[PDB]
Amino acid sequence: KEEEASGKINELRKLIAKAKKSGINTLKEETALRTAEIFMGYAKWDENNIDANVKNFSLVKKYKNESEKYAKLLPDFERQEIIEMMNSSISELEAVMRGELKRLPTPVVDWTKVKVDKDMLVYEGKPVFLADWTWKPRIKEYIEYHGNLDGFFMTNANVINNKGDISPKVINELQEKEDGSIGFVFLNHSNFPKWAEKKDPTVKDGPGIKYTMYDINHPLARQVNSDLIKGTVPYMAGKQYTGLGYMLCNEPHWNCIEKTWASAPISEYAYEEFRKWLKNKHGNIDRLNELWSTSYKDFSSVDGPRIMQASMQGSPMYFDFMAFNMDRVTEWFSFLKNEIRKYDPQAKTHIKIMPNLWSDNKRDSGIDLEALTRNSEIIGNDASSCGAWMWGKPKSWEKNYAFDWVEICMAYDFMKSVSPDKVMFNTEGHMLSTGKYRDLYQTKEYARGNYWLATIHGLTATQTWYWCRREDGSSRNGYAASNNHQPRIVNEVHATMIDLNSVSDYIMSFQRQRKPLRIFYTKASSINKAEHMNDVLRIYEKLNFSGLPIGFATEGILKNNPHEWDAIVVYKTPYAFKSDIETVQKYLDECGTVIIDNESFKTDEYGRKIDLTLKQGKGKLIVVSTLNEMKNEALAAVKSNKGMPMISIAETNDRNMPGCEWRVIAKDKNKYIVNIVNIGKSDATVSMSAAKGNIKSVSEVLTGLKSATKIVLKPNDVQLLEVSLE
């Protein structure tokens, strides 16, 4: 397969030179050719280092039993993937050269010239979308086609003394570092300097395991972070390598439920901050004593446990602890951002937030996705998707869906509800592999569908996990059967960016489209309930396959964002802040529509019967009993404001449920752009009609080929169609 692969590579290389002569933009095929050239060397390394790959595959649970076989077959698997990729590239380009496929213009992005503008990354006055790879060697061979993301890494360990002196190695790097390509600054928090630990060992208490291994409420922690930022950021300020911002922490969390993963008790400094937060929350100690059933003489005497028990969920002390943990974490990230802004007043910050700390049920992490998203100039995350785990009972998505769609659809939709006008930067993309998922045979169709779908929901740039391959093909649980062994996956991410760039105005219209239904979200219900996000997902899923972007409402969204929706839905939200209800009342008072079930808005965050109830007044207050009723009323509210899509879609499949998420935008008077992704785990047939009038024609935007009003999508398939009406 070595000789055969080299043959196809040489064939594509000559076809590229010929197409170029005709003025064809061969970026896509050059990207594939470069991928092939790189992975031929990786396959040669694999062929010469079988023993190293046996070890690599043994560390992977589903490839452990057959490790010797897998290490033997890997080199020819990689060459066979290159042969498939060259056959696809040669077929496509020969069709393009013969006028049989229409190739849209697409930019050759110079990353030294990309700028952030509102919710876009701009090259030569147009929106673009960026992909690079974690730990990829920054060499010419790898930055020509596979991304040119720059940046700078630092750690509080680079503060070498109490005086605030910075490691000379770090000063030397920053003095020499060129302006460079668009990049981000990575703040490390796992490595706190030993001199500080020796000076006051309490500085290690109440960590946010494992990525913040010191006390965010300790004064020596604040001195050290202030000293790091003061001594480094003046060298970075305004530089192109800071353009995608300052990443304030890797996967932060301060889990505080005893016997749970990455949990620890909070420090004594943190508990003193808790007494201050309780004084602000409750006003007088008598109000705390009534709720906690305690007899403290004042706020300084509060002296409850420094870690919570799962059995306490629903109690006032538990609520207070989790609410405080969120607020002090938000304040910590505010402190880091305000220190950076002193030395770089243009700094954009973000946080590598795990979206499942909002999309799953747990609220003990101190991660307030709304507050951290609002507080960030760039929407940071490391959203995961991927397929079935290598072990365990099926996840709930496996009944209906090809992959875990919940973070890149529902969490993205929450983040964009909070902040619609920001770039979104996935700083460790987990849409190809995780610790739990791996498949050597992962399809280019899966890879394209995922990056495409995530981009429809707001994703602007991705540093994908991960390019652990060194230039020689050696390695710097995660490695075997990751992208480091998959030539067609590495190539398809960049091919997807090329297509998204080619239609980036359409893509920004899909990202920005009116979200006319907002699901009400409150921390009052998520903190007190074991399974609030099961309920929020159930109503999201119920609404999300009707052609409409589905978004979220909170108190903060209603107070800070234009009310560009037709209705709020309130589902299984029995706990609410009084201020939630008051804010939803003000929306009814502006003639808003609220659709509420029988179970919602019954108590405050302490389970006390609520003094206040929603009154219809000038708006529309609709009480419903079922999910079906709630959906029927929601879509009626959109129809009443003429907000339904201009193209109607029906889906049939062998399941009980839709999987095709679809969207429609206007291209002009009688032409529409239809976006469809099959998130379902089996083939779906979509059937399209005009809402008014009659479909004249359907074509593929990317190919110019004629399509039909009835289409089969395989799982992970993407359709982008131009629909003309008569």
Numbering used by the authors: 45 to 520, 526 to 775
What does the paper say about this structure?
The polysaccharides in red algae (Rhodophyta) are primarily mixed galactan agars such as agarose and carrageenan. Carrageenans are high molecular weight polymers having a linear backbone of repeating D-galactopyranose units (G) linked together by alternating α-1,3 and β-1,4 linkages. Detailed analysis of the enzyme activities encoded by the CarPUL, combined with interpretation of growth phenotypes, have allowed us to propose a refined and detailed model of κ- and ι-carrageenan processing by some Pseudoalteromonas species.
We were unable to crystallize GH167 from PS47 so to investigate the molecular determinants for activity on β/κ-NC4 we utilized a homolog from Bacteroides ovatus CL02T12C04 (BovGH167), which originates from the same putative carrageenan PUL as the BovGH16 carrageenase, possesses 36% amino acid sequence identity with GH167, including a conserved putative active site, and has the same enzymatic activity as GH167. The structure of BovGH167 revealed four domains, three of which are often seen within the GH42 family. The conserved domains are domain A, the catalytic (α/β)8-barrel domain; domain B, a 5-stranded parallel β-sheet surrounded by α-helices; and domain C, an anti-parallel β-sandwich. The unique domain is an all α-helical region at the N-terminus. Structural alignment of BovGH167 with BbgII from Bifidobacterium bifidum S17 (PDB ID 4UCF39) revealed that E295 and E472 [E288 and E473 in GH167 (numbering for the predicted matured protein)] overlap with the acid/base and the nucleophile, respectively, with additional conserved residues in the −1 subsite. Furthermore, and consistent with the membership of GH167 in clan GH-A, it points to a retaining catalytic mechanism that is shared with family 42 GHs. Further supporting this, GH167 was inactive on κ-NC4 but after treatment of κ-NC4 with S1_19B, which removes the 4-sulfate from the internal G4S residue converting the tetrasaccharide to β/κ-NC4, GH167 again produced products consistent with the formation of κ-NC2 and β-NC2.
